[PDB]
Structures are given as structure tokens and as C-alpha cells.
From a paper:
To overcome the conformational flexibility observed in the RPi complex derived from a fully duplexed DNA and to obtain a higher-resolution structure, we subsequently used a DNA substrate with mismatched bases at −12/−11 (mutating the NT strand from A−12C−11 to C−12A−11), which we used previously, and analyzed the structures using cryo-EM. The complete molecular models for σ54 consisting of residues 1 to 477, the PspF1–275 activator of residues 3 to 259, were obtained and helped in interpreting the RPc models above. Notably, we observe that the N terminus of σ54 RI traverses from the side of RNAP, through the DNA strands, to enter the [name] hexamer pore. σ54 RI-H1 is N-capped by P17, which also causes the N-terminal fragment to make a sharp turn toward PspF1–275. Once through the DNA, the σ54 RI N-terminal peptide (RI-N; residues 1 to 14) enters the [name] hexamer and interacts with the L1 loops of five of the six [name] protomers. [name] forms a nonplanar closed ring. The L1 loops do not follow a strict spiral arrangement but track the characteristic hydrophobic residues in σ54 RI-N, with Phe85 (of the GAFTGA motif) in different protomers interacting with conserved Leu residues of σ54 RI-N. The local promoter DNA opening at −12/−11, where σ54 RI-N passes through, is further enlarged compared to that in RPc. The [name] L1 loops interact directly with DNA via phosphate backbones involving several Arg and Lys residues near the GAFTGA motif within the L1 loops (83GAFTGAQKR91). Our structures here reveal that despite the initial DNA unwinding/melting, the RI-H1 and ELH remain in similar positions as in RPc, so inhibiting open complex formation. The positions of RI-N in relation to the hexamer suggests that upon ATP hydrolysis, σ54 RI-N captured by [name] could be translocated further into [name], leading to the unfolding of RI-H1 and thus releasing the inhibition RI imposed.
Author numbering:
A (entry chain D): 52 to 151
B (entry chain M): 1 to 48, 109 to 477
C (entry chain C): 846 to 945
D (entry chain e), E (entry chain f): 1 to 259
DNA sequence: AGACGGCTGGCACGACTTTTGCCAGATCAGCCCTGG
DNA sequence: CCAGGGCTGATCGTGCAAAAGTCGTGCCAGCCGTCT
């Protein structure tokens, strides 16, 4: 697909050195990148070595922390577990700052 | 007459931006449509064993290298070898020219003779003569391998050498006078040549998938067979209730408005997609009614038709039917076809009747195939055969059709009995 | 395109097809060892352009034109026995019935 | 370089000199106008006028003021663009536009409605014309040829014809000699006619002319020069229409009684 | 606008005042009427006068009063808008709107139809003009140049010319002299054209004229002014056919019989 | 060995299909303001 | 407190026609089979 899962221009090339587009398909090109398709002409195995990233503009916590036997965010902020679990779901409205 | 700028009357036409979008909506395939429709759904907020088997396979090219590894050679010989067998097809002859491969090496030391060597070393590997670089010699290599003892060997070797043109135009009269071979004994040399496996690489890859999704379905329940659309395929939008119950009680004008506008959109889009579907079923249905014929009968029994034929059975305009037919495939007992397909040109037969070209072109294919192989039927001879049937096609029509079915001429399909 | 059992398998010897009948199934009562072919099925390949190479190959040999692939039912390795009986079920609408 | 002689004969007298005039006219790209009696072979020498000249491959298209019609007259000359006026489904090329790089024949100049002359008055000078109901203009270089039945100069005094129009045309004139001015070529044109007609009716051969014919031929005034002469001889031949003794009677007039 | 250089061969007393008269007028916006006798050289002045004026890159656009069709007359003069009538498909720019900031040079207006006189007059004096079916009035300055050989003062009395149209039209009318009147300038022009003609017909050069020829051509009614001179020297040159001796043959009238 | 007849295929020219491109407007009903 | 007037917004609308495309059949050129 285009700009998605199992897509081109991400995660590497396809089964052969040939570009998805259709041009620049041979061993003569080793590191060049075409204009109609942006795909590095390399081996297929490198597909299992290239990962992807997602922006996720909205912040998101890691469930491995603050949900195990010890609470990391809890021990860092001196905050109980119930309050953090209630504030990580838009139903607590904790206060950030304000000294006046 | 006279020239002036007067006014006429009696007509009907109306359109708008939003309605337009609703109309183009049915012209594009569900799969490609559902994409367009997913995109709508981001914009509108109120509208809603790990490796299993994973058996890595052989792959031919992969097979070629496994023996490259246990062939003995140098680094330069193993480098050219990877180059050569890199550039080889599923069929098995090589894609690039050999002088091209020299440009891929980029080495002054590398020479054509050196390449001729590594190539030919790996040219008799597995299976026989693979990496051919333009068949003629591939055949020549497989000939090469087996024993002198088999008769007619030198004959097949002479022909294959430099008399290819003679065999491709099937002009055996010329072949006989050129090669000065035996009369109707050469036949068996040619038969040897015939059983030599052209395209020896193909063999490896065979595992090919099943893949086609029928839009509509039509299937012989007691006669009068009935069309129903594909349930799984058909796209569907459903109103979000949460957000529907959060427009009224809303305290702000921003929010309230916001929610109304979207609901408006959304209800409209639903109604438009709903439309697409109904059209297409009404229409499916109306095309197979007329073309009742065809399912049982075959491609021969198709009546010749135009959109008008199917548009006037419905109440919609012609263009509309034209937009809804593109890229929809409807599955039936007989197979999967595109909905376009039914529609074709007619030609006028004897007895006032007309015949669908498709059906005649199916007819020509059976007739031409089922003929004495010593004497091929020429086009005009057929025209005459059809005329007996009543079709009265003419000869260029039939050439056209006969060359469309990817079948070459009569003088060109002539062969030894 | 549809797949049919016509015993017209390319890239195979006559010895293998010596036990296959017209439609492609094996005669009742025969024996089979190793990886012999039982039912000869082929898978169609997509049409191509003029293709001067394939055009020449079809003008010379013919009847194949790389249209079908060898996808015949063969016995798995390490299996030896004799066939008791065959059976064929065809859906409604299709009336090929070579030897059914 | 093709001669295109076609049916050219009757070369005995002065006519031969006018051939010898118009003969280098084609190379020149100027106004050219001819004057002759109706049917004094007024077309055939103006057609020849195009093939001989440079663009001998230029498209040939031709019009007459006598026909044309009062209405579509404006549209037919300059031509009309599409949608310019109601009922105009597609753009239609103008008559002037039709022939570009080719000579256009003009006839019945002697008549010409005051309306017709004015519209084409500036079309042929700077070679510029704009289609009716057209946003833009077009430029062409066509070689106008005119032909008349009558005396243009006398008409100019009366005013049934503009001086300006006269000036643009008539670079050189060419007066075809009246056939009855000939006296020589009667007989060769004669004989040619003879033979054609005998040929068409699938008769074996031509017998001759029987002097009485010859005598009476000279006497007639001959109003249409090569156009009643041909016709006369076809219509006389048909009355005989055999292969024996030559024909003696002259069907000068077909509304005369058989008896 | 700094340099303009084409034609205008004549260099005589009369042609001097008029040429220098054009120069004064060209800067000024006001419309100028070009009157005269046929063939004097009006398409010269009007073209050249247009650009001497301060608008030269602006569109310049001609027509013929007589040429435009009577039925579409409103559209030719002004134009339409898409949807106005069964025939039209889009807004139509008109000659009056085609001429924004440029100049409109009517040609041979003296023959313009009765309707034509009653169309352009109101929109010319002011610049107000409503497009056929247009919602609002369209306003434009199109410099006006128009010229004709007729005599308007004589014509207005007859009643074939609207009165005032001759009147809000005529500021600084320009009058050219005839060929017979210049006399001194005639010799230079003959040499020019000839050399031009002879060069056109793959000829080397000019022989020059003789005293006979000089005298002959000098004294003439010289009717068509410039149009006729060039005709004559340019027909005579064709007939001479060579440069071996001086040119002597004069063809004045083409039309009375060559022996 | 040369001419004649047959074959095929390219290209052209009407008769005929089909495919893409439009872009609101007026009219009716409920609620709010105001007169009776 | 009840009836009259204004005004906004909500609602209804899948075709007509213009140009590009395909269709069938004829015309003509070039290759090849066969008799004299
Ligand atoms: N010298 C000539 N030799 C042969 N035929 C001639 C000659 N002059 C004229 N004709 C013939 O005379 C008849 C004259 O045609 P003409 O009357 O001039 O046409 P138009 O009426 O259109 O000017 C023609 O059909 C033509 O073939
Ligand atoms: N001084 C001049 N210089 C060059 N050519 C001239 C002159 N006077 C007249 N002419 C010519 O004769 C013709 C001009 O037409 P013109 O007098 O426009 O006719 P009208 O006045 O009738 O438009 C031209 O072909 C132009 O060469």
C-alpha cells in the first residue's frame, strides 16, 4: 500500500531488487533511489530489520509502568495509584501548578 | 431559413455541488470506495500461533544459488555468478544482455570470454539449460546433453541451429528445400524438438493463490434465478448515538452548531451510499433478466445488447447505468464476470435476427479449433460457414474477431499430421 | 480464469502420465509409490503483451504459451499403496463431465 | 510538373495567343480578371489558371454571386464561429478560409448585389477577415479570379458597381475571342464533338460532314460559343446515329417541329 | 512608440502637412475622421495614426460598417453573455469591449446600415454600453478612427446619414490629396513599385523608363489615386518581360482591346 | 521462372455507443416579536 | 394574555447533453501458392 502497513518506501524493499513502481529493477543499481518510487534497491532480508514509527500527537502513557507491582510514576510523583488511574482517563482533572 | 436569437422550450435539468459528490459515488469499486468512505469517517465524529506455518520456500533463483555455493570457483567467479543468476526469470532465460552484465561488473579485468565461461558453467545446472539468453540455444543445450544413440539427432540439430524462422512460420515446403531433409521423415525430428521443454525454469514455482471478490450473486433457485447483493462486501454506516444525544443538551452555540452540521452531513452520506447499493441491485437484476439466456446456454447464447436496452427497463438515465456498471464483478454458477461484459455490439443475420458479437466470436473459436489439422480454415472460408448458420458477418469482421482471440492465421497454424 | 483437469501438464515425462486417464484421474486398481501424480490440475496465468520471445515460443511449440502451471495432485513422500476408488463432485451450473 | 492538358483543342487562331498570355499568369500572385461571352470557355482557362501557378496542389473551391442567396450570404463569405448564433451546433469554416494557398474562382461579378460587394470589399486587399460572432481575426493569401458576361466599365458609370471594387480587381484583363470571331476553330472543335458523341453510343465510326453543313455553319450568329456548338453536334449526331453516309442536317434548334 | 518605420513613400508639399498633422493629433485622445478619394492611402493613416497616439501596446481593432450582419448587429457592436439565448454558451466580448484602451478604426463607414448608425451613436459619445442581457452597464474608452471616401456634408442633406453622428464624430477630420494633385512625387513612386514588381518575378533589375514613358504616365486623370498607379506601372512591367532596354510600353487602360 | 489468384492486415469513413462534466435555487414550517 | 406577522433555516432534489470512443465494413498494398 501507500503510507501504511506492509507498504512501500517504508520497512525496506520488496521480494526482489525491482521497485514497486516498475523501473530500476536489476543488480546494476545498488544504492540509488528512483523518482517515481522511493525504494532502496537492497536485499529482501532487510525487511525483517526495519521498524516504523507513529507520531501519536496526543500523549500516551506506558502500561508497563505504574501498573506493575511497584508504581514508577507513583514513586516519582508521590501520588497514589487510584488517582493516577483516574487521571489517565479524563475523569479526575488533577491540578498542575498554582501557588497563589 | 433565417438567422436570429430566439428562445426555445421544453426541458429538464438541475444540479448542485453536494449532489454531484453523491453521484460520482457509485462509479468506483467497493474496495476502492470503502477507502473513500473510511476517509469520511475520520472527518466526521458522529458517524460510525505467531508464525502459523511460515514455511520459507525454494524459488528457483534460490535453488540456483544453493548449487552456486557448492560449485568450486574464485571470488570473481562467485561475484559474476551472483550477477548472472540474479538476473534470471521465472521462465528461466536471462533478462539482461551479456554485454550488459559486463557493465554491471565495472571492472577492466572482466572480459566477455570470462563471462562466457562462468555462465556456461552454471548453464547446465538444475534444471537443464536455464539462464538461456534467448532460446534457440536453450533448446540446443538440452539436445546437447542426451546420447548419440537416439535417431534423428543430427536432423533436429540442423534445424534448431539456423533454421528457426523456417519452423516459426511453419513453412515446411521451404524447410525441405533449404535443409534438404527427408520428406515426412523430418516430421519425427521435428517431434523430437517438440518434446524438449522451452521454458524449463517455470517448473519450480507452482504455488499460486485464489483471488477475486464478487459484488453480486445469482444462482438458479428452481428456474427464474435470483440476484442478491454481497452482504460481506457491502459498506455500511450507522449513526453514532452518543453524539446524537449530545447536540440538544449542549450549552454553547459553537458545540451545538457543530454537532448539527455534522449530523446533517452524515445523514446525507448515509442516504447516498444507501442509494448506490439499491441502484446497483435493481440494475444487476435488470441485466441478468434479459440475459436469462446466457447462463445456461453458454457464451453462444447471449443476446446482443446496448445500454439503452437495459436503461429503458429501468427508470434511470443511460449514463447512470454506465457509472454503476464499472468495475463490479458479479459471481454466478458459471463463473465470475465483469458487469460491463454483458453489453456488446450486434451484427445482423439472416431471418432479420441479430447476433452478439461475443457469442459469434465464441462460436468462431470453437469452429476454428475443431478443424482438420492438415487443412486450416481460412477467415473467408469461415465467413462462408457462418453464413450457413445465418450470421453474414463479412471477412474483416471475422479477421478482427479471429485475431482478437489471440489466435494466429490459417496458413500460420498449418502442421504435419 | 477457471481451473480444469485436462491431464495437459507441461514440464513432465510421458512415464508419469502413463497411469493417468483422459480427465486425469488414475484408473481404479492401479498402484502408486513416492510422489506420482494422481489428479492433473493446472492454474491459469494472466495474459501478456505481444512478447516476441513468448510469441516465438508459442509459434514453435504451442498449446502451452506459459498459460498454465503444473499444480497436479501428487502423493506425499514416503507413501506407497494402491488406489481403491475415485470420486468427483461437480457443483450445479458446470457440466464439463469429462469422465464423471 | 503536370501538363493537365485534358480537353484542349481549337488552337488555330488568336485564342492560341491568349493561351500564350495567361500561360505565365499563374506564377504571379496578383488580381486577374477575365471577360468573355457566356460559355466562351470561361471556366476551363480559369481553372487552368490554378494548376499552372505555384501552389498547383492548393485546394480549389469556387462560388457564384448569381446564386449564393440573400440570407446566409454574410455567413457563407466570412464564415461563422460555433455558438455565435442560435442553432449553430458546431463551428463552420468560412468560404475564404476553406481555400488557403489555393486560387478561388469568381463569377457573375457583373451582377453583384450592393450588399454582396460591400461585405467582400475589404476581404481581398490585406487578406484579413473575421468570422461572424468570432472573438478573433484570420489572415489569408488566396488569388482571386473574376469572370464576367458583360461590360464592367459601363456599369461603373451607372453605379451598379463600385469603383473601389473595380480597382482592387482587374490587375490584367483577358478577353476570350468570340467563337464567331474565330471562323477557323469551328471545324476542329466540331470534329472533336463528332467523335465523342459517336463514341459514347457505341457506334463503330464517324462518317463525315456533307458540305451543306459546313456552308450553313458559318451563317449562324452563334450566341454561346463552345456551348451550343458542342451541344449542336451531339444533338445532330443522335438524329443520324448510324455508321453509313455522313450527316447532312443541322439541328441548330431542338424546339423546331419534326415535320 | 519611439520608432515607427514603414511605407509612406510620398514626399510632397501636401503630403507633408497631413503627415505632420497626424503627429499632432496622435497624442491627443479625440477621434479623427479620415475623408478622401479612393486609393489615396487611408489604411495608412489610420494604422499609423493609431500608434502615434498614446496607447500602442493596447489592442487595435478594425471592421467594415457594411460587412457585419444585420441580424446579429447588436452582438457585433456589443455582444452577449452565456445563457442569454438558446444559441449562446458563454459571455461574449464585443468589438467595443475588445477595443479597451486601444482604438477602433471603422472602415468605409459611409455605407454603414441605418440600424448601425443608430447603435453606435449613444455608446460612442459617452462610453456607456450594456452587454446583451447583462445585469449592469459596461464602460470603456476605445479610441475612434474611422475614414471614408464619401462627402458627409452632401450626404447629411440627403438623409442617409444620421445627423449628429456625422457631428459627435468629426473633430479634426483629416483630408488627403489626390494623385493628379501631387505631380512631383509621382516619379519616385513609379521607380519604387517597379523595382519591387520586377524583384517579385525572379527578375534581375530595372532598365528604367524613357522620356515617352515619363510624359505619358505623368499626364493622366489618375482616378484611382495610389491603387491605379501601382496597378499601371505593375502590369506594364510584366509585359516588357526584360531589362535589356528601357521600359516604354504603357498600359494605361487594361480593358479597351489590345491588338 | 513469371503471372494470377488468394490471403491478411493497415487505414479510412460514417453510423452508432458511452463516458465525463455540471453546481441552486426556491418553498414551507416552527419560533420569536409584537399588536390586539 | 392571545392572535398576527416576519424570518431563518430545514427540505427536496441521481439527470441532459456534448465530445470522445468504438463499431463494422470497405479499399488497397504486400506476401506467397500454383500453373504454364
Ligand atoms: N479550346 C477549347 N477546347 C475545348 N473545349 C472547350 C474550349 N473552350 C471551351 N470549351 C468547352 O466549352 C464549354 C464551355 O464552358 P463555359 O461555358 O465557359 O463555362 P462557363 O459557362 O461556366 O464559363 C465547356 O463545357 C468546355 O468543355
Ligand atoms: N504613400 C503611399 N505609400 C505607399 N502605398 C500607398 C500610398 N498611398 C497609397 N498607397 C497604396 O495603395 C493601397 C492603399 O489602400 P487605400 O487608399 O487603403 O485604399 P483606401 O483609401 O481605399 O483604404 C495600398 O495598397 C497602399 O500601397
Amino acid at each position: 500500500e501507500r503510507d501504511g502497513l506492509f507498504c512501500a518506501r517504508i520497512f525496506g524493499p520488496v521480494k526482489d531488487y525491482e521497485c514497486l513502481c516498475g523501473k530500476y529493477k536489476r543488480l546494476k543499481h545498488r544504492g540509488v533511489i528512483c523518482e517515481k518510487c522511493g525504494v532502496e534497491v537492497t536485499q529482501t532480508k532487510v525487511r525483517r530489520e526495519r521498524m516504523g514509527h507513529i507520531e501519536l500527537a496526543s500523549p500516551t502513557a506506558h502500561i508497563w509502568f505504574l501498573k506493575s507491582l511497584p508504581s514508577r510514576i507513583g514513586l516519582l510523583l508521590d501520588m497514589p495509584l487510584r488517582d493516577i488511574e483516574r487521571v489517565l482517563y479524563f475523569e479526575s482533572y488533577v491540578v498542575i501548578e498554582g501557588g497563589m | 431559413m433565417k438567422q436570429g436569437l430566439q428562445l426555445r422550450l421544453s426541458q429538464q435539468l438541475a444540479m448542485t455541488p453536494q449532489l454531484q459528490q453523491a453521484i460520482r459515488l457509485l462509479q468506483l469499486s467497493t474496495l476502492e470506495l470503502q477507502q473513500e468512505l473510511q476517509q469520511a469517517l475520520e472527518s466526521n465524529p458522529l458517524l460510525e500461533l505467531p508464525v502459523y506455518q511460515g514455511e520459507t520456500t525454494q524459488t528457483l533463483q534460490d535453488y540456483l544459488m544453493w548449487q552456486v555455493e557448492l560449485t568450486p570457483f574464485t571470488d570473481t567467479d562467485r561475484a559474476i555468478a551472483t550477477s548472472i543468476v540474479d538476473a534470471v526469470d521465472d521462465t528461466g532465460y536471462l533478462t539482461i544482455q551479456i554485454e550488459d552484465i559486463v557493465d554491471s561488473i565495472g571492472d577492466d579485468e572482466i572480459g566477455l570470454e570470462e563471462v562466457e565461461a562462468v555462465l556456461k558453467r552454471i548453464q547446465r545446472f538444475d534444471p537443464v539449460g536455464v539462464a538461456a539468453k534467448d532460446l534457440r540455444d536453450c533448446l540446443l543445450i538440452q539436445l546437447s546433453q542426451f546420447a548419440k544413440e537416439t535417431p534423428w539427432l543430427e536432423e533436429a540439430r540442423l534445424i534448431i541451429s539456423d533454421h528457426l524462422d523456417l519452423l516459426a512460420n511453419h513453412d515446411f515446403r521451404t524447410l525441405m528445400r533449404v535443409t534438404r531433409l527427408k520428406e515426412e521423415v523430418l516430421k519425427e525430428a521435428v517431434n523430437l524438438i517438440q518434446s524438449l521443454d522451452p521454458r524449463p525454469g517455470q517448473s519450480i514455482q507452482t504455488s499460486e493463490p485464489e483471488y477475486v471478490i464478487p459484488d453480486v450473486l445469482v444462482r438458479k433457485v428452481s428456474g427464474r434465478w435470483t440476484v442478491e447483493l454481497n452482504a460481506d462486501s457491502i459498506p455500511r454506516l450507522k449513526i453514532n448515538q452518543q453524539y446524537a444525544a449530545m447536540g440538544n443538551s449542549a450549552r454553547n452555540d459553537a458545540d451545538g452548531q457543530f454537532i448539527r452540521s455534522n449530523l446533517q452531513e452524515a445523514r446525507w452520506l448515509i442516504k447516498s451510499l444507501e442509494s448506490r447499493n439499491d441502484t446497483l441491485l435493481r440494475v444487476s437484476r435488470c441485466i441478468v433478466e434479459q440475459q436469462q439466456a446466457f447462463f445456461e446456454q453458454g457464451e453462444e447464447y447471449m443476446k446482443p445488447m446496448v445500454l439503452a436496452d437495459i436503461a429503458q427497463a429501468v427508470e434511470m438515465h443511460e449514463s447512470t447505468i454506465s457509472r454503476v456498471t464499472t468495475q463490479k464483478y458479479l459471481h454466478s454458477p458459471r463463473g465470475i464476470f465483469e458487469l460491463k461484459y454483458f453489453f456488446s455490439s450486434h451484427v445482423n443475420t439472416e431471418g432479420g435476427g441479430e447476433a452478439s458479437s461475443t457469442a459469434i466470436r465464441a462460436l468462431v473459436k470453437k469452429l476454428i479449433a475443431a478443424e482438420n489439422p492438415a487443412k486450416p480454415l481460412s477467415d473467408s472460408k469461415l465467413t462462408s460457414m457462418l453464413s450457413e448458420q445465418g450470421i453474414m458477418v463479412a471477412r474483416r469482421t471475422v479477421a478482427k474477431y479471429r485475431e482478437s482471440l489471440s489466435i494466429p492465421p490459417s496458413n500460420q497454424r498449418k502442421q504435419l499430421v | 480464469g477457471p481451473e480444469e483437469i485436462t491431464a495437459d501438464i507441461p514440464n513432465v515425462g510421458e512415464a508419469a502420465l502413463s497411469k493417468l486417464d483422459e480427465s486425469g484421474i488414475v484408473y481404479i486398481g492401479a498402484e502408486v509409490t513416492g510422489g506420482d501424480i494422481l489428479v492433473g490440475k493446472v492454474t491459469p496465468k494472466g495474459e501478456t503483451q505481444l512478447t516476441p520471445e513468448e510469441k516465438l515460443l508459442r509459434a514453435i511449440f504451442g498449446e502451452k504459451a506459459s498459460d498454465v502451471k503444473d499444480s497436479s495432485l501428487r502423493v506425499p513422500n514416503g507413501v506407497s499403496g494402491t488406489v481403491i476408488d475415485v470420486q468427483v463432485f461437480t457443483r450445479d451450473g458446470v457440466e464439463k463431465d469429462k469422465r464423471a | 510538373m503536370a501538363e493537365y492538358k485534358d480537353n484542349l483543342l481549337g488552337e488555330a487562331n488568336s485564342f492560341l495567343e491568349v493561351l500564350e498570355q495567361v500561360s505565365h499568369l499563374a506564377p504571379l500572385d496578383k488580381p486577374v480578371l477575365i471577360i468573355g461571352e457566356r460559355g466562351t470557355g470561361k471556366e476551363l482557362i480559369a481553372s487552368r489558371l490554378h494548376y499552372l501557378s505555384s501552389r498547383w496542389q492548393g485546394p480549389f473551391i469556387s462560388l457564384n454571386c448569381a446564386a449564393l442567396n440573400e440570407n446566409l450570404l454574410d455567413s457563407e463569405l466570412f464564415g461563422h464561429e460555433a455558438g455565435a448564433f442560435t442553432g449553430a451546433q458546431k463551428r463552420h469554416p468560412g468560404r475564404f478560409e476553406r481555400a488557403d494557398g489555393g486560387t478561388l474562382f469568381l463569377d457573375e461579378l457583373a451582377t453583384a448585389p450592393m450588399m454582396v460587394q460591400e461585405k467582400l470589399l475589404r476581404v481581398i486587399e490585406y487578406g484579413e477577415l473575421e468570422r461572424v460572432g468570432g472573438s478573433q481575426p484570420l489572415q489569408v493569401n488566396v488569388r482571386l479570379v473574376c469572370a464576367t458576361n458583360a461590360d464592367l466599365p459601363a456599369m461603373v458609370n451607372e453605379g451598379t458597381f463600385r469603383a473601389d471594387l473595380l480597382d482592387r480587381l482587374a490587375f490584367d484583363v483577358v478577353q476570350l475571342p468570340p467563337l464567331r470571331e474565330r471562323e477557323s476553330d469551328i471545324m476542329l472543335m466540331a470534329e472533336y464533338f463528332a467523335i465523342q458523341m459517336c463514341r459514347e453510343i457505341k457506334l463503330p465510326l464517324f462518317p463525315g460532314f456533307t458540305e451543306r453543313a459546313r456552308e450553313t455553319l458559318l451563317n449562324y450568329r452563334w450566341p454561346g460559343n463552345i456551348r451550343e456548338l458542342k451541344n449542336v453536334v451531339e444533338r445532330s449526331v443522335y438524329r443520324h446515329g448510324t455508321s453509313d453516309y455522313p450527316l447532312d442536317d443541322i439541328i441548330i434548334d431542338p424546339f423546331k417541329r419534326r415535320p
